[PDB]
Amino acid sequence: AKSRSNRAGLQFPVGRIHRLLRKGNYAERVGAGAPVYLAAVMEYLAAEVLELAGNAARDNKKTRIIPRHLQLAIRNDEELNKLLSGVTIAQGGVLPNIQAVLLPK
Amino acid sequence: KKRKRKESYAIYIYKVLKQVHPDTGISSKAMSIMNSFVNDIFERIAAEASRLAHYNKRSTITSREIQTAVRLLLPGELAKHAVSEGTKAVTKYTSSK
Amino acid sequence: GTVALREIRRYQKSTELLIRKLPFQRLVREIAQDFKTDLRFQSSAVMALQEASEAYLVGLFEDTNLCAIHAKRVTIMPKDIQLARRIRGERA
Amino acid sequence: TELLIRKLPFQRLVREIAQDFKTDLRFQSSAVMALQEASEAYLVGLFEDTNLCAIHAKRVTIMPKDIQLARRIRGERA
Amino acid sequence: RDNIQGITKPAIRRLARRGGVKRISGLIYEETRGVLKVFLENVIRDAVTYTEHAKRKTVTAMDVVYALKRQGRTLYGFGG
Amino acid sequence: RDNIQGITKPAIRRLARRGGVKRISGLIYEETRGVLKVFLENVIRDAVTYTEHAKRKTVTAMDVVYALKRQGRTLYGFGG
DNA sequence: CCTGGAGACTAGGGAGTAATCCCCTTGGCGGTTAAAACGCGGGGGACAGCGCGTACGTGCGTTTAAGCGGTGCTAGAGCTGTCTACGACCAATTGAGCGGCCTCGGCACCGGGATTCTTATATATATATATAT
DNA sequence: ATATATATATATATAAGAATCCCGGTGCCGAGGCCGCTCAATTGGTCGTAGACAGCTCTAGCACCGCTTAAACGCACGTACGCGCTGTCCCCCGCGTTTTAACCGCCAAGGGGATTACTCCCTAGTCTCCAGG
């Protein structure tokens, strides 16, 4: 009658998340509240990532998100750079900064 | 004849983008890059929950293992936000149940 | 000096691959034939290897510049890269 | 193989830090021993990297900028 | 009761002798205490998380081993 | 054919500009080549090892993803 | 004087042999074009060295608490039993997402005017030097 | 010592060579919306083992005091060590030139992810003989 993503109101597939959890060789029994928790947490994290990427795109006056926007969004955010420390973003780079001793006088 | 049914998180996060920035599109290769991001965090914290269930010698993973994985791996406010929305995600999952 | 400073600000905002893809493909095939010959390759694998190597080299050059600044210099030497790889743990 | 940090001030410091998170936490002596061993083995490598940076800075006296470079290359700062 | 000064100056000096340092400046000790403070704010908090997930208030060494292997610091000793 | 000379020193200088380097010495390129050959004999050997138990001589990008995550290098890109 | 155990014949299920659908690469061939190698000048930064402040190294006097050890108190970790309840699983249903095809506008691309940048140089001004009573 | 006159050096505009953006027009290809349908989600009974809870226990953690002795702090002098600085020279940067290899394009052929005509090996149903109860 009602799908669990519609029932919980989350945008993420609770059924697909639970299906990956059951075949993921983590536990012989997987609870019902855990995929809802996982879907809500990943939904908010993806919403934060898309929000910062949209802010970076509006800074670059583009309505299409490029990985340079994600590169400038993750690394500028402190907790995103701290969590995604070893993450390398494809088609990106570094934050544009100039060292003080390399500056012209 | 199509090749295969490749399942992805394209339309869900596309709806997330449309409810965050309705007038902003996204390139598909950046979409697959952050799909790899989402699946990587899934495989990180699901293994974290499995390890925490192994530490309790428990063969069943509840939402409490996911709570411990969130408050261990996520630093700063992204921990305590994701806990706070994660409890109320359960309650609306158990309201009309 | 200033002309050398001009491309410093230019390549910090560009996300294009500085290494030409065909010599990189030749080098990947030359390395891979040493392990096991007659290896078919996808182009996406070569592109992922090229972007990972370029990002790792950019980070290592950032650490090299940090070591050169720490030694009160603006010119880099290989001992900066040696110290960066030793602190990074990449030194075997 | 001896420990240059005394056990009782270190245990006082550990319980002082743990009181900030959760009040009334009982502690094993083995937990304090493992924390002291891990912290000492971590700081010995920190002093080795600091000495390597000071040698790279052509000095025999260590400086805070050596630790600043060593932890930045190590990536311990967020 | 503050106990960050319990890590006394000859203790850090002897550890720097173990660390292979000939001369130690006078202001190294404050940054050493700060880095040890950061490390012990991380590991002890992770151990509190491991203990509260185990429904205990008694902090064990095995939770310390869990917190150390979570951060990639593999140790061979007590706990197992 | 030796293709280690295909990494031209203008490209290494451009990587240094992207890496933020003011002055580049002439002998930086030799150790740069020595570093990148080690980096391309670690990950490539790991990818061949991942492909070998897949029973193929066709190298896929997912083997490169597995090789990169084996060594801790997290890449969000080609291969998924 | 009569029914059931057992060897032989045969229908059905299933996985190995080899060919195939077609798809992705792929060396090879030919035109193009722009990035690299090379070299000349020069310039500015790494380096040597010499002196100069100076700051931990050591050592002894004074303090001091770490730790051993013994005793007592006790908080909860863990074991045992007992109920229970929620997911695992099987079978039927059913609609959501994936693929494919059209389509249309967001952004790549050229380009000249406006915008800085920079950088040697013109010019106003501070100062060292020469002469004499 | 001071008045008069000259010339060298220095700071700031400054104007012209040089690189950058951006508004203006053009396209094109990759987002982004509709059909077909499929496969994975949903719903439902059952049961069975994971888990929560009551109670004991015992076992390690906590506290506290004698004592004593290694450990810590602080003053004193110094001597080796960090640091400015002045030549220097040499190695790397700025720019013109060849060339050469990267890029683009195509094709024919072959390996291969997956699928399929065919085919022999394993398994169970059925028929008739003889041997027993």
PDB file of N, CA, C and O (backbone and C1' of nucleotides) in Angstrom, chain H residues 22-53:
ATOM      1  P    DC H  22      33.888  39.415 -15.603  1.00  0.00           P
ATOM      2  O5'  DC H  22      33.013  40.700 -15.972  1.00  0.00           O
ATOM      3  C5'  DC H  22      33.548  41.684 -16.860  1.00  0.00           C
ATOM      4  C4'  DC H  22      32.592  41.957 -18.007  1.00  0.00           C
ATOM      5  C3'  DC H  22      31.448  40.964 -18.127  1.00  0.00           C
ATOM      6  O3'  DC H  22      30.346  41.583 -18.765  1.00  0.00           O
ATOM      7  C1'  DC H  22      32.798  40.774 -20.021  1.00  0.00           C
ATOM      8  P    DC H  23      28.946  41.725 -17.993  1.00  0.00           P
ATOM      9  O5'  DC H  23      28.011  42.498 -19.033  1.00  0.00           O
ATOM     10  C5'  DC H  23      28.420  43.756 -19.554  1.00  0.00           C
ATOM     11  C4'  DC H  23      28.563  43.692 -21.062  1.00  0.00           C
ATOM     12  C3'  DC H  23      27.318  43.201 -21.810  1.00  0.00           C
ATOM     13  O3'  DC H  23      27.036  44.059 -22.904  1.00  0.00           O
ATOM     14  C1'  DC H  23      29.206  41.963 -22.472  1.00  0.00           C
ATOM     15  P    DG H  24      25.628  43.949 -23.669  1.00  0.00           P
ATOM     16  O5'  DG H  24      25.960  43.089 -24.976  1.00  0.00           O
ATOM     17  C5'  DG H  24      26.540  43.722 -26.107  1.00  0.00           C
ATOM     18  C4'  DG H  24      26.656  42.761 -27.279  1.00  0.00           C
ATOM     19  C3'  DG H  24      25.435  41.872 -27.525  1.00  0.00           C
ATOM     20  O3'  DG H  24      25.124  41.863 -28.912  1.00  0.00           O
ATOM     21  C1'  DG H  24      27.382  40.545 -27.346  1.00  0.00           C
ATOM     22  P    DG H  25      23.741  41.246 -29.445  1.00  0.00           P
ATOM     23  O5'  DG H  25      24.199  39.952 -30.263  1.00  0.00           O
ATOM     24  C5'  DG H  25      25.000  40.111 -31.428  1.00  0.00           C
ATOM     25  C4'  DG H  25      25.597  38.789 -31.873  1.00  0.00           C
ATOM     26  C3'  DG H  25      24.586  37.672 -32.148  1.00  0.00           C
ATOM     27  O3'  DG H  25      24.923  37.023 -33.366  1.00  0.00           O
ATOM     28  C1'  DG H  25      26.236  36.913 -30.656  1.00  0.00           C
ATOM     29  P    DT H  26      23.935  35.937 -34.020  1.00  0.00           P
ATOM     30  O5'  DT H  26      24.643  34.542 -33.694  1.00  0.00           O
ATOM     31  C5'  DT H  26      25.926  34.257 -34.241  1.00  0.00           C
ATOM     32  C4'  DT H  26      26.355  32.829 -33.937  1.00  0.00           C
ATOM     33  C3'  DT H  26      25.262  31.767 -34.058  1.00  0.00           C
ATOM     34  O3'  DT H  26      25.800  30.607 -34.679  1.00  0.00           O
ATOM     35  C1'  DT H  26      26.235  31.654 -31.927  1.00  0.00           C
ATOM     36  P    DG H  27      24.840  29.567 -35.435  1.00  0.00           P
ATOM     37  O5'  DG H  27      25.126  28.181 -34.694  1.00  0.00           O
ATOM     38  C5'  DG H  27      26.411  27.576 -34.786  1.00  0.00           C
ATOM     39  C4'  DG H  27      26.706  26.703 -33.572  1.00  0.00           C
ATOM     40  C3'  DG H  27      25.786  25.491 -33.384  1.00  0.00           C
ATOM     41  O3'  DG H  27      26.538  24.411 -32.869  1.00  0.00           O
ATOM     42  C1'  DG H  27      25.765  26.769 -31.454  1.00  0.00           C
ATOM     43  P    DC H  28      27.117  23.270 -33.837  1.00  0.00           P
ATOM     44  O5'  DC H  28      27.857  22.280 -32.826  1.00  0.00           O
ATOM     45  C5'  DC H  28      28.272  22.756 -31.548  1.00  0.00           C
ATOM     46  C4'  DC H  28      27.689  21.907 -30.434  1.00  0.00           C
ATOM     47  C3'  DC H  28      26.840  20.723 -30.898  1.00  0.00           C
ATOM     48  O3'  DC H  28      27.014  19.637 -30.006  1.00  0.00           O
ATOM     49  C1'  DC H  28      25.557  22.078 -29.508  1.00  0.00           C
ATOM     50  P    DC H  29      28.045  18.454 -30.344  1.00  0.00           P
ATOM     51  O5'  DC H  29      28.535  17.972 -28.903  1.00  0.00           O
ATOM     52  C5'  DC H  29      28.729  18.929 -27.867  1.00  0.00           C
ATOM     53  C4'  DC H  29      27.702  18.753 -26.760  1.00  0.00           C
ATOM     54  C3'  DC H  29      27.207  17.318 -26.544  1.00  0.00           C
ATOM     55  O3'  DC H  29      27.128  17.051 -25.157  1.00  0.00           O
ATOM     56  C1'  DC H  29      25.386  18.747 -26.784  1.00  0.00           C
ATOM     57  P    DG H  30      27.944  15.826 -24.519  1.00  0.00           P
ATOM     58  O5'  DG H  30      27.681  15.973 -22.950  1.00  0.00           O
ATOM     59  C5'  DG H  30      27.731  17.258 -22.339  1.00  0.00           C
ATOM     60  C4'  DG H  30      26.403  17.611 -21.681  1.00  0.00           C
ATOM     61  C3'  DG H  30      25.772  16.502 -20.830  1.00  0.00           C
ATOM     62  O3'  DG H  30      25.229  17.063 -19.644  1.00  0.00           O
ATOM     63  C1'  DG H  30      24.223  17.259 -22.406  1.00  0.00           C
ATOM     64  P    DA H  31      25.335  16.276 -18.248  1.00  0.00           P
ATOM     65  O5'  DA H  31      24.384  17.104 -17.266  1.00  0.00           O
ATOM     66  C5'  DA H  31      22.989  16.826 -17.224  1.00  0.00           C
ATOM     67  C4'  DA H  31      22.177  18.106 -17.284  1.00  0.00           C
ATOM     68  C3'  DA H  31      20.830  18.032 -16.600  1.00  0.00           C
ATOM     69  O3'  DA H  31      20.341  19.347 -16.384  1.00  0.00           O
ATOM     70  C1'  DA H  31      20.516  17.986 -18.930  1.00  0.00           C
ATOM     71  P    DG H  32      19.314  19.647 -15.187  1.00  0.00           P
ATOM     72  O5'  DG H  32      17.929  19.047 -15.710  1.00  0.00           O
ATOM     73  C5'  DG H  32      17.239  19.677 -16.783  1.00  0.00           C
ATOM     74  C4'  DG H  32      16.078  18.820 -17.243  1.00  0.00           C
ATOM     75  C3'  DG H  32      15.659  17.745 -16.244  1.00  0.00           C
ATOM     76  O3'  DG H  32      14.492  18.138 -15.423  1.00  0.00           O
ATOM     77  C1'  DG H  32      15.655  16.958 -18.525  1.00  0.00           C
ATOM     78  P    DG H  33      13.221  18.987 -15.963  1.00  0.00           P
ATOM     79  O5'  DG H  33      12.732  18.245 -17.290  1.00  0.00           O
ATOM     80  C5'  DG H  33      11.771  17.196 -17.186  1.00  0.00           C
ATOM     81  C4'  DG H  33      10.805  17.211 -18.355  1.00  0.00           C
ATOM     82  C3'  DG H  33       9.547  16.398 -18.144  1.00  0.00           C
ATOM     83  O3'  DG H  33       8.582  16.762 -19.121  1.00  0.00           O
ATOM     84  C1'  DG H  33      10.989  15.233 -19.586  1.00  0.00           C
ATOM     85  P    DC H  34       7.107  16.127 -19.081  1.00  0.00           P
ATOM     86  O5'  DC H  34       7.201  14.863 -20.055  1.00  0.00           O
ATOM     87  C5'  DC H  34       6.215  13.844 -19.984  1.00  0.00           C
ATOM     88  C4'  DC H  34       6.093  13.108 -21.304  1.00  0.00           C
ATOM     89  C3'  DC H  34       5.261  11.846 -21.248  1.00  0.00           C
ATOM     90  O3'  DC H  34       4.840  11.512 -22.556  1.00  0.00           O
ATOM     91  C1'  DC H  34       7.517  11.256 -21.508  1.00  0.00           C
ATOM     92  P    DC H  35       3.690  10.415 -22.779  1.00  0.00           P
ATOM     93  O5'  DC H  35       4.501   9.064 -23.041  1.00  0.00           O
ATOM     94  C5'  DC H  35       3.811   7.833 -23.089  1.00  0.00           C
ATOM     95  C4'  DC H  35       4.638   6.780 -23.793  1.00  0.00           C
ATOM     96  C3'  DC H  35       4.347   5.354 -23.357  1.00  0.00           C
ATOM     97  O3'  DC H  35       4.613   4.456 -24.421  1.00  0.00           O
ATOM     98  C1'  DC H  35       6.547   5.911 -22.748  1.00  0.00           C
ATOM     99  P    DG H  36       3.817   3.065 -24.520  1.00  0.00           P
ATOM    100  O5'  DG H  36       4.957   1.995 -24.845  1.00  0.00           O
ATOM    101  C5'  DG H  36       6.175   2.021 -24.119  1.00  0.00           C
ATOM    102  C4'  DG H  36       6.796   0.640 -24.056  1.00  0.00           C
ATOM    103  C3'  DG H  36       5.930  -0.422 -23.420  1.00  0.00           C
ATOM    104  O3'  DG H  36       6.412  -1.703 -23.803  1.00  0.00           O
ATOM    105  C1'  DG H  36       7.605   0.322 -21.891  1.00  0.00           C
ATOM    106  P    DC H  37       5.725  -3.047 -23.253  1.00  0.00           P
ATOM    107  O5'  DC H  37       6.618  -3.432 -21.987  1.00  0.00           O
ATOM    108  C5'  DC H  37       8.037  -3.479 -22.109  1.00  0.00           C
ATOM    109  C4'  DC H  37       8.710  -3.598 -20.750  1.00  0.00           C
ATOM    110  C3'  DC H  37       8.029  -4.546 -19.757  1.00  0.00           C
ATOM    111  O3'  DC H  37       9.016  -5.276 -19.051  1.00  0.00           O
ATOM    112  C1'  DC H  37       8.309  -2.456 -18.769  1.00  0.00           C
ATOM    113  P    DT H  38       9.340  -6.798 -19.443  1.00  0.00           P
ATOM    114  O5'  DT H  38      10.596  -7.161 -18.524  1.00  0.00           O
ATOM    115  C5'  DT H  38      11.717  -6.286 -18.482  1.00  0.00           C
ATOM    116  C4'  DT H  38      12.027  -5.863 -17.056  1.00  0.00           C
ATOM    117  C3'  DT H  38      11.853  -6.956 -15.996  1.00  0.00           C
ATOM    118  O3'  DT H  38      12.943  -6.925 -15.104  1.00  0.00           O
ATOM    119  C1'  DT H  38      10.635  -5.046 -15.380  1.00  0.00           C
ATOM    120  P    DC H  39      13.681  -8.285 -14.682  1.00  0.00           P
ATOM    121  O5'  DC H  39      14.723  -7.812 -13.570  1.00  0.00           O
ATOM    122  C5'  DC H  39      14.951  -6.425 -13.367  1.00  0.00           C
ATOM    123  C4'  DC H  39      14.335  -5.957 -12.060  1.00  0.00           C
ATOM    124  C3'  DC H  39      14.502  -6.921 -10.881  1.00  0.00           C
ATOM    125  O3'  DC H  39      14.886  -6.199  -9.728  1.00  0.00           O
ATOM    126  C1'  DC H  39      12.259  -6.312 -11.095  1.00  0.00           C
ATOM    127  P    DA H  40      16.117  -6.701  -8.829  1.00  0.00           P
ATOM    128  O5'  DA H  40      16.014  -5.801  -7.514  1.00  0.00           O
ATOM    129  C5'  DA H  40      15.671  -4.428  -7.624  1.00  0.00           C
ATOM    130  C4'  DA H  40      14.407  -4.122  -6.845  1.00  0.00           C
ATOM    131  C3'  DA H  40      14.395  -4.638  -5.397  1.00  0.00           C
ATOM    132  O3'  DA H  40      13.897  -3.635  -4.529  1.00  0.00           O
ATOM    133  C1'  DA H  40      12.452  -5.292  -6.492  1.00  0.00           C
ATOM    134  P    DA H  41      14.294  -3.629  -2.972  1.00  0.00           P
ATOM    135  O5'  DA H  41      13.089  -2.850  -2.274  1.00  0.00           O
ATOM    136  C5'  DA H  41      12.514  -1.715  -2.904  1.00  0.00           C
ATOM    137  C4'  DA H  41      11.003  -1.765  -2.799  1.00  0.00           C
ATOM    138  C3'  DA H  41      10.476  -2.066  -1.392  1.00  0.00           C
ATOM    139  O3'  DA H  41       9.646  -1.012  -0.930  1.00  0.00           O
ATOM    140  C1'  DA H  41       9.427  -3.462  -3.033  1.00  0.00           C
ATOM    141  P    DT H  42       9.136  -1.003   0.594  1.00  0.00           P
ATOM    142  O5'  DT H  42       7.706  -1.721   0.528  1.00  0.00           O
ATOM    143  C5'  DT H  42       6.744  -1.306  -0.436  1.00  0.00           C
ATOM    144  C4'  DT H  42       5.536  -2.228  -0.432  1.00  0.00           C
ATOM    145  C3'  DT H  42       5.016  -2.605   0.960  1.00  0.00           C
ATOM    146  O3'  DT H  42       3.650  -2.235   1.098  1.00  0.00           O
ATOM    147  C1'  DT H  42       5.201  -4.516  -0.437  1.00  0.00           C
ATOM    148  P    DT H  43       2.942  -2.316   2.538  1.00  0.00           P
ATOM    149  O5'  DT H  43       2.292  -3.780   2.577  1.00  0.00           O
ATOM    150  C5'  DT H  43       1.231  -4.105   1.691  1.00  0.00           C
ATOM    151  C4'  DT H  43       0.770  -5.538   1.886  1.00  0.00           C
ATOM    152  C3'  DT H  43       0.472  -5.943   3.334  1.00  0.00           C
ATOM    153  O3'  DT H  43      -0.793  -6.585   3.393  1.00  0.00           O
ATOM    154  C1'  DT H  43       1.893  -7.519   2.319  1.00  0.00           C
ATOM    155  P    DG H  44      -1.445  -6.973   4.810  1.00  0.00           P
ATOM    156  O5'  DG H  44      -1.049  -8.508   5.002  1.00  0.00           O
ATOM    157  C5'  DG H  44      -1.555  -9.490   4.106  1.00  0.00           C
ATOM    158  C4'  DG H  44      -1.144 -10.887   4.538  1.00  0.00           C
ATOM    159  C3'  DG H  44      -1.105 -11.118   6.051  1.00  0.00           C
ATOM    160  O3'  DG H  44      -1.679 -12.379   6.360  1.00  0.00           O
ATOM    161  C1'  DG H  44       0.956 -11.719   5.102  1.00  0.00           C
ATOM    162  P    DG H  45      -2.243 -12.677   7.834  1.00  0.00           P
ATOM    163  O5'  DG H  45      -1.440 -13.979   8.298  1.00  0.00           O
ATOM    164  C5'  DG H  45      -1.942 -15.271   7.974  1.00  0.00           C
ATOM    165  C4'  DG H  45      -0.851 -16.327   8.050  1.00  0.00           C
ATOM    166  C3'  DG H  45      -0.467 -16.780   9.457  1.00  0.00           C
ATOM    167  O3'  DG H  45      -0.155 -18.163   9.422  1.00  0.00           O
ATOM    168  C1'  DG H  45       1.430 -15.926   8.380  1.00  0.00           C
ATOM    169  P    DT H  46      -0.230 -19.065  10.749  1.00  0.00           P
ATOM    170  O5'  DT H  46       1.083 -19.965  10.644  1.00  0.00           O
ATOM    171  C5'  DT H  46       2.194 -19.494   9.894  1.00  0.00           C
ATOM    172  C4'  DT H  46       3.477 -20.119  10.394  1.00  0.00           C
ATOM    173  C3'  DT H  46       3.530 -20.336  11.890  1.00  0.00           C
ATOM    174  O3'  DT H  46       4.570 -21.244  12.182  1.00  0.00           O
ATOM    175  C1'  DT H  46       4.970 -18.592  11.346  1.00  0.00           C
ATOM    176  P    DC H  47       4.538 -22.122  13.523  1.00  0.00           P
ATOM    177  O5'  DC H  47       5.888 -22.976  13.437  1.00  0.00           O
ATOM    178  C5'  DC H  47       6.911 -22.600  12.514  1.00  0.00           C
ATOM    179  C4'  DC H  47       7.993 -21.785  13.202  1.00  0.00           C
ATOM    180  C3'  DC H  47       7.993 -21.879  14.728  1.00  0.00           C
ATOM    181  O3'  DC H  47       8.995 -22.824  15.258  1.00  0.00           O
ATOM    182  C1'  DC H  47       8.402 -19.635  13.934  1.00  0.00           C
ATOM    183  P    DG H  48      10.458 -23.079  14.616  1.00  0.00           P
ATOM    184  O5'  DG H  48      11.051 -21.633  14.271  1.00  0.00           O
ATOM    185  C5'  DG H  48      12.343 -21.517  13.692  1.00  0.00           C
ATOM    186  C4'  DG H  48      13.268 -20.681  14.563  1.00  0.00           C
ATOM    187  C3'  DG H  48      13.779 -21.362  15.833  1.00  0.00           C
ATOM    188  O3'  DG H  48      15.087 -20.907  16.100  1.00  0.00           O
ATOM    189  C1'  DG H  48      12.650 -19.417  16.423  1.00  0.00           C
ATOM    190  P    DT H  49      16.153 -21.860  16.827  1.00  0.00           P
ATOM    191  O5'  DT H  49      17.484 -20.977  16.827  1.00  0.00           O
ATOM    192  C5'  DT H  49      17.698 -20.025  15.789  1.00  0.00           C
ATOM    193  C4'  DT H  49      17.649 -18.598  16.318  1.00  0.00           C
ATOM    194  C3'  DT H  49      18.575 -18.300  17.502  1.00  0.00           C
ATOM    195  O3'  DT H  49      19.149 -17.012  17.334  1.00  0.00           O
ATOM    196  C1'  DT H  49      16.407 -17.656  18.041  1.00  0.00           C
ATOM    197  P    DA H  50      20.573 -16.655  17.989  1.00  0.00           P
ATOM    198  O5'  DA H  50      20.455 -15.095  18.312  1.00  0.00           O
ATOM    199  C5'  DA H  50      20.096 -14.180  17.283  1.00  0.00           C
ATOM    200  C4'  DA H  50      19.599 -12.851  17.845  1.00  0.00           C
ATOM    201  C3'  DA H  50      20.449 -12.224  18.944  1.00  0.00           C
ATOM    202  O3'  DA H  50      20.482 -10.812  18.767  1.00  0.00           O
ATOM    203  C1'  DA H  50      18.275 -12.802  19.794  1.00  0.00           C
ATOM    204  P    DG H  51      21.344  -9.876  19.746  1.00  0.00           P
ATOM    205  O5'  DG H  51      20.295  -9.438  20.867  1.00  0.00           O
ATOM    206  C5'  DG H  51      19.034  -8.913  20.478  1.00  0.00           C
ATOM    207  C4'  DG H  51      18.124  -8.714  21.677  1.00  0.00           C
ATOM    208  C3'  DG H  51      18.817  -8.243  22.959  1.00  0.00           C
ATOM    209  O3'  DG H  51      18.024  -7.250  23.578  1.00  0.00           O
ATOM    210  C1'  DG H  51      17.536 -10.135  23.411  1.00  0.00           C
ATOM    211  P    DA H  52      18.712  -6.049  24.391  1.00  0.00           P
ATOM    212  O5'  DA H  52      17.636  -5.689  25.514  1.00  0.00           O
ATOM    213  C5'  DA H  52      16.255  -5.602  25.178  1.00  0.00           C
ATOM    214  C4'  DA H  52      15.363  -5.923  26.374  1.00  0.00           C
ATOM    215  C3'  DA H  52      15.847  -5.407  27.723  1.00  0.00           C
ATOM    216  O3'  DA H  52      14.735  -4.956  28.476  1.00  0.00           O
ATOM    217  C1'  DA H  52      15.655  -7.774  27.799  1.00  0.00           C
ATOM    218  P    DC H  53      14.944  -3.974  29.728  1.00  0.00           P
ATOM    219  O5'  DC H  53      14.560  -4.883  30.982  1.00  0.00           O
ATOM    220  C5'  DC H  53      13.333  -5.599  30.986  1.00  0.00           C
ATOM    221  C4'  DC H  53      13.348  -6.695  32.036  1.00  0.00           C
ATOM    222  C3'  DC H  53      14.012  -6.313  33.363  1.00  0.00           C
ATOM    223  O3'  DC H  53      13.223  -6.779  34.447  1.00  0.00           O
ATOM    224  C1'  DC H  53      14.958  -8.289  32.541  1.00  0.00           C
TER     225       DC H  53
END
